[PDB]
Amino acid sequence: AVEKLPEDFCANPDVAWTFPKVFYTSSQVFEHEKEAIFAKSWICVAHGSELAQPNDYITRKVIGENIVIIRGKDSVLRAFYNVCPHRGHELLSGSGKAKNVITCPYHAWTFKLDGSLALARNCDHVESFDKENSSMVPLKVEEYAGFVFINMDENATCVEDQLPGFAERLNQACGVIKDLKLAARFVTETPANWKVIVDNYMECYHCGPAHPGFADSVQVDKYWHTTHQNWTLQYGFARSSVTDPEFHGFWTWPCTMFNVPPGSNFMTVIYEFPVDAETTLQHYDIYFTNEELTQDQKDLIEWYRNVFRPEDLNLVESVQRGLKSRGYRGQGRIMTDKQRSGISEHGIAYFQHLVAQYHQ
Amino acid sequence: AVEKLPEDFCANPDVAWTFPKVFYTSSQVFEHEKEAIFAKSWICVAHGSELAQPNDYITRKVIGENIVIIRGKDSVLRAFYNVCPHRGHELLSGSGKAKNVITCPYHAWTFKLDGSLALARNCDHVESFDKENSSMVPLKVEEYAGFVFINMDENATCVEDQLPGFAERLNQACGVIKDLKLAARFVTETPANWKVIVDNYMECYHCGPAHPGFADSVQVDKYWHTTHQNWTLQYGFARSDPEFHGFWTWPCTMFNVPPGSNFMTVIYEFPVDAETTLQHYDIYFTNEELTQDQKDLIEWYRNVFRPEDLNLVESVQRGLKSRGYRGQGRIMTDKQRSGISEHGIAYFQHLVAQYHQ
Amino acid sequence: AVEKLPEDFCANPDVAWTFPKVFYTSSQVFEHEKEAIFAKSWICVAHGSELAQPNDYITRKVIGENIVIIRGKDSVLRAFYNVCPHRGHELLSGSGKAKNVITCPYHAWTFKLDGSLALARNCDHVESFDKENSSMVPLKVEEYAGFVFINMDENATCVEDQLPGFAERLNQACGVIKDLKLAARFVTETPANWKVIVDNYMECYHCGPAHPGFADSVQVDKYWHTTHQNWTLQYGFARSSPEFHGFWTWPCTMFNVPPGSNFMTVIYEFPVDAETTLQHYDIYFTNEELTQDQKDLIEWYRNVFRPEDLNLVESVQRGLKSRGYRGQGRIMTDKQRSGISEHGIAYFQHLVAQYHQ
Ligand SMILES: COc1ccc(-c2cncc3ccc(C(=O)NCCCn4ccnc4)nc23)cc1
Ligand SMILES: COc1ccc(-c2cncc3ccc(C(=O)NCCCn4ccnc4)nc23)cc1
Ligand SMILES: COc1ccc(-c2cncc3ccc(C(=O)NCCCn4ccnc4)nc23)cc1
Ligand code: FES
Ligand code: FES
Ligand code: FES
Ligand SMILES: [Fe+3]
Ligand SMILES: [Fe+3]
Ligand SMILES: [Fe+3]
């Protein structure tokens, strides 16, 4: 039996509850979200700086797919499943500059940076060798809002159709997105469903108790969480200890988050690549405009690494454990207040209302 | 198809065999035993001393359930599923002294030590906020025989209904139970079905060959294993005569009162899955500060005695999956019911068999 | 629906493709290969040198079965499931010289080295104790080509029926096989289907790119892969500044007689599940006291040669689960059947295919 949700699930944030627990734990729900959501949506994978020059490539894994994204010699950005068409060896590893051809490690077939088979060894002596159908298998990729998105659906349109208006507002909050460079990346296999991790991001109800260092840097009467078109913006004014330093927190469907902290001069990005119902690989990327980091930046990197990020990781991990309990009645009340203050949870209701549309 | 046993399974200990091997390995058998037995029986979790003072609390995990047991400000012992009613964060960790209210770490809802929602931050501004229906979810707990039992079955009666006479007999074996204090705990995730570990305890057929260091005290002809009602007693006199008690109680807690009757060890089996059982091996002394002779005995249990029994049940769990294991094992019951008779296994499995009709 | 193949699957190596990817990943396909192939075929486990003397024994694990192969008092080689018939404890571990009877470590039942029950403690006072049928459970074992093969099918015939002509030809490749002794064993749990590891051994298409240090001996001009009857031979001439043999035998044991013909390496594959295969990589020399050249070569295999092949099969296992991998891979057979032809794969897979009708 398949679990289904109503169309109006969390349609009313003022009186709303989180998903029945099975949606956070069921492997069958995950397998449905994997193909209905993560194989048919634009999945953000990197900032443009990782792929800015010809021959630049990166590799990612999401929902079990090892994918390579590569800027071809023609400067055309492409993405491919990272698997040789001869006998399935992976083609590239890590990140870097590709040679002028991709040489598979197992039998040294070569491919052009557009996936075309360049040379199959001993090809000429193999009967009825299919040169056309021995090329790398592509998927869609789009450079959007200064970042890179992939899509496994061959019939997808463009990122703007998925996140209407998002590219312009993000560039409004940070005017140096195009000069950012990856300063630090935190990689964690998190034992929480991807939806639990989004829930946590979508509210600051927990900042008082769970985030001491991120609690004075934020005004509760000067904090607004507005929903948009498959994304939301959490905006507020800071004063930890520019007559009004602002901060931005974007959530975009399905689960990528873009943060522009006070100053608007750098970004952190949360990438969620789901693994299974109770596992989500996370990239926590910190981006600065300078390549050689000052020590105030290196300290900031370690503060997120060792103090700030561990707090949210424990939260989502404990929640994943708790909601399997028979002592958890099943659903959790979303603490929306009618003024949408800085500790209102209504943003969770907006996210989950979108998720619910995939469970009819 | 679900496995089942004749209700007369091991009804005759003189001619009996262990479960067909699938009962030790099948996930569908385990999931049935998990709910039919471990979610509906009294599960011993601690000695009372761990919960003797107001605000004292402990946490246990059993059959996938994180449970908190907590002595309220009002001195009333209660138990709760260890999960906040708002959005599922765990409430307490480890063991110790709870504050006067429980503060959930995620959104800082407050709960009185009886589970009551005290204050949910900003509730007053949340439409249609439910007062209780947002309280901690409790489960039954009872102090019995000086120990603490929990029960996830809301319609369970009392521990005495489950173990008729056990409190009476254990208090005759050790008269200082309430003065006991936890001296040491061995936590082991053991890769054996919980029933393999009970099988192991229910017989001394193996003590000669498998426990060399535990042979210089026991007497083979002054050893008796008598069955009662959902518990059994292994009773004997030890080489000088000091007596000793080995209680097994349904489903899988064992209480040992070694010679001297002044201390106890207790085996708690918290099953995890068909082939995994969390074990607490607790040693309890009446004194707070351990002597160095007590630390040595603790060490012997930890490094010599317990490894022998853990190795046996781990090896058996592997071996009974072999296609070369014909399926069932003969229970070595003798007419005399000697110090090495295995008939106690038949009593244990006959009760288990009643849950597989 | 269960996955099936045409009988002519890879019957024509000139126009052939590897299995549809489900055959390398499906646990149902594995369970069928497990029982149709690995429980009914002769499985090579060791060289004779390990079991040459009375009471010598080894232990192996393959397809979930812990097996002991033991040379009886009477110099008769036997194989048994390594599980006591009483209550399932394992009987022996590792390799070594067994004592005149096997004494189980749980209840000290004794067995003779031919599997018969010697003495079951207290049996005399146990009602209806079955002495015949309280035996170690045997399985078939055969010494062939200087090696030892087991078979879980008690109606199995002999290894020659499985590998017709193999011993004859192997003894021509290495004339001192009976003089070999185990110098080194690399045990690796490999996350690849057993068939992926065979596919890899069956071709030298990959030696140029994947084995740089192994490239001066791999000459396409002087390298032949001929198929026979459930085994194949990759024979070539090496370049110094001498011939070499590489036998694959059904289902998955590979015997290498490298240049010089004075030593052997052997690849034993013991599949675990669809995506896990335990491998033994055995290096055999005739002398017991290794020289530094031999000690250096063992480490070259351990740190240089074998890691390259292990990475190849591990990446392939990952890659063929990709939705970007079209079902099957083209087997690169060339008309000449050169040293880089992949036709050996088609021979192997056509045989496998016979078990998937
Ligand atoms: C170092 O960057 C990060 C990265 C992640 C976050 C972050 C962490 N945890 C929970 C959260 C909930 C909500 C939000 C949000 O609504 N977004 C912005 C608010 C936080 N902000 C401060 C300055 N700029 C943004 N962020 C959260 C903050 C800072
Ligand atoms: C001290 O804690 C343990 C913990 C585990 C055991 C234990 C382990 N395995 C099998 C067993 C069979 C029978 C019995 C028994 O008769 N138990 C009663 C007191 C035995 N006693 C004598 C001297 N010291 C202790 N115990 C067994 C004993 C003792
Ligand atoms: C020395 O032991 C090993 C052990 C493993 C191999 C080996 C490993 N991987 C792929 C392979 C493909 C083909 C062949 C072959 O052609 N095998 C025949 C013996 C050729 N020879 C070379 C050096 N010495 C002997 N071997 C492969 C070779 C040698
Ligand atoms: S896998 Fe054979 S060439 Fe890439
Ligand atoms: S989860 Fe306990 S307060 Fe929100
Ligand atoms: S288990 Fe081997 S003798 Fe009892
Ligand atoms: Fe947070
Ligand atoms: Fe014991
Ligand atoms: Fe190789």
Numbering used by the authors:
A (entry chain A): 3 to 243, 253 to 371
B (entry chain C): 3 to 242, 255 to 371
C (entry chain B): 3 to 243, 256 to 371
Paper excerpt:
The carnitine monooxygenase (CntA) and associated reductase (CntB) responsible for carnitine oxidation to TMA was originally identified in Acinetobacter spp. but was subsequently found to be present in a range of gut microbiota species. CntA belongs to a large group of non-heme-iron–containing Rieske oxygenase family. The oxygenase component has a conserved [2Fe-2S] Rieske center coordinated by two cysteine and two histidine residues and a catalytic mononuclear iron (Fe) center. We observed a head-to-tail α3 trimeric structure for CntA, with the Rieske [2Fe-2S] cluster and mononuclear Fe center at opposing regions of the monomer 44 Å apart.
We thus used a random approach by screening drug libraries and successfully obtained three inhibitor compounds MMV1, MMV3, and MMV12. Furthermore, we report the discovery of the first known CntA inhibitors and solve the structure of CntA in complex with the inhibitor, demonstrating the pivotal role of Y203 through a π–π stacking interaction with the inhibitor. Interestingly, Tyr203 and Tyr295, both of which are important for the coordination of carnitine in CntA, also play a key role in binding to the inhibitor. Tyr203 forms a π–π stacking interaction with the 1,6-naphthyridine core ring, and Tyr295 forms polar interaction with the oxygen on the methoxy group in the inhibitor. Interestingly, the inhibitor is also coordinated to the mononuclear Fe via a nitrogen on the 1,6-naphthyridine ring at distance of 2.65 Å and to an oxygen of the carboxylic acid moiety of Asp323 at 2.7 Å. Other π–π interactions are also observed between Phe319 and the phenyl methoxy group and between Phe258/Phe247 and the imidazole group. When the binding pockets of carnitine and MMV12 are compared, Phe258 moves to accommodate the imidazole group of the inhibitor, whereas the loop containing Phe216 is drawn in closer to the active site to form the π–π interaction with the inhibitor. Cocrystallization of the substrates and the competitive inhibitor with CntA unveils the role of the π–π stacking interaction as the key mode of inhibition. The data presented here suggest that CntA substrate analogs are less likely to inhibit its activity and rational drug design should perhaps take advantage of the presence of several aromatic residues in the binding pocket to utilize a π–π stacking interaction as we have demonstrated in the inhibitor compound.
